[model samples]
Target: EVETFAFQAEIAQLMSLIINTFYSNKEIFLRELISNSSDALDKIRYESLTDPSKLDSGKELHINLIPNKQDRTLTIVDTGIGMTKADLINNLGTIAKSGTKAFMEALQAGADISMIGQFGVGFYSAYLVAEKVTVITKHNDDEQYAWESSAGGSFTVRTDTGEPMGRGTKVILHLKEDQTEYLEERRIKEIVKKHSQFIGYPITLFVEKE
Candidate 1:
């Protein structure tokens, strides 16, 4: 059976803010996810500097975008530091690096909406566009795991018995109603170039032939 968990009290409040107030700029979600992917890549690469066989071994490091219109899904794949089951429980269950209570305090203090992403919870921004979100990740220290959440204050984590990602994370966003703009290749390109061109890693968009 898959393990289920609820977001920490502070994190639940944080998600409320993200879905209700802090996310006025919906298009920025892509940029935020890309930013996170780049950071993950930086981490693994930096670690690999000292220990070359860190993660993915000689696999090419890059970000991929796969938008499927018929299925109404947008997938972002990163060949970077993937999360283990424990990582998923810790990272997704509670606020990891930054304190959710700290952000909540700032929000109560009337922190600017722009300050939302500053706390490293940009992953929650995807909830602005997706009704459901799925994460498939593989780490060197642990087997593959699948995490699913609707940003509705709780999430689930389970072992992945299917094909592994080798080493990395794959985030699949199930787009919300009328949020089809994200499924357009042109729109995806525009958003990426506008916000993530300087990300220092190759961002590839997988588009179907016309």
Candidate 2:
């Protein structure tokens, strides 16, 4: 069953704060998303310390920036520790419930990745440019699932029956009319070079044509 749930109380207010306060730096969301992917990657790498089997097979830790002009969409993909259904709810569903505790736990465990993605607020930053956002992911311990929202105060999560995923998360942003610049190769490179020049993992932008 495809289930829908209302955004936790804080998210609506947080979304407005982000949408209104981030007037000029709308591009910051890309940086936020990449940081999230990096964090997820670090998590899986940490999990491998105790269980080598936690590592996704033959997949390097990397993030991919793919733009589809035909679809008016941009995707940020990472081969990282993907989310399970409960994770989707606890991590992304409620904005003030889960991240802080996990981040603190990571600190005590000596996992050094900065867990800046508190309560999945960074994920909600997609609304800065996207009218609709789709997330598809497969976790090593669980099957594939998708979460989607349009910032309508509610979102949906469903079992995904699409292409088989090895392991990772893919965020698709359906850009608003004026946000087409995000789909430009030059623009994306500029953002990556400016914001994530010192990123820990490889970030690859696939340009379809000249």
Off-target runs (Cα >4 Å) in candidate 1 are 55-58, 93-98, 108-110
Residue-level error in angstroms, candidate 2, position 163: 1.3
Q: State each model's CA lDDT, in order.
A: 0.81, 0.79
TM-score of 1: 0.90
The model with the greatest lDDT is: 1
Q: Write the per-residue lDDT of candidate 1 for residues 1-210, one digit (tens) a residue.
A: 798899776667766776777455688889888888888888789889888878544467899999998889999999988887887888642354466656667778988555556776778778778989999998787888999988777899989887768888899999998798999999999999898889988999999756
TM agreement with the true structure for every prediction? 0.90, 0.85
lDDT score, candidate 2: 0.79
Per-candidate alpha-carbon RMSD to the true structure: 2.1, 6.0
- Cα shift from native, residue 208, model 1 (Å): 2.2
- Colliding residue pairs in candidate 1: none
Lowest summed lDDT across 10 adjacent residues in model 1 is found at 92-101
Candidate 2 stretches greater than 4 Å from native: 20-22, 56-58, 93-120
Error of 1 at 146 (Å): 0.4
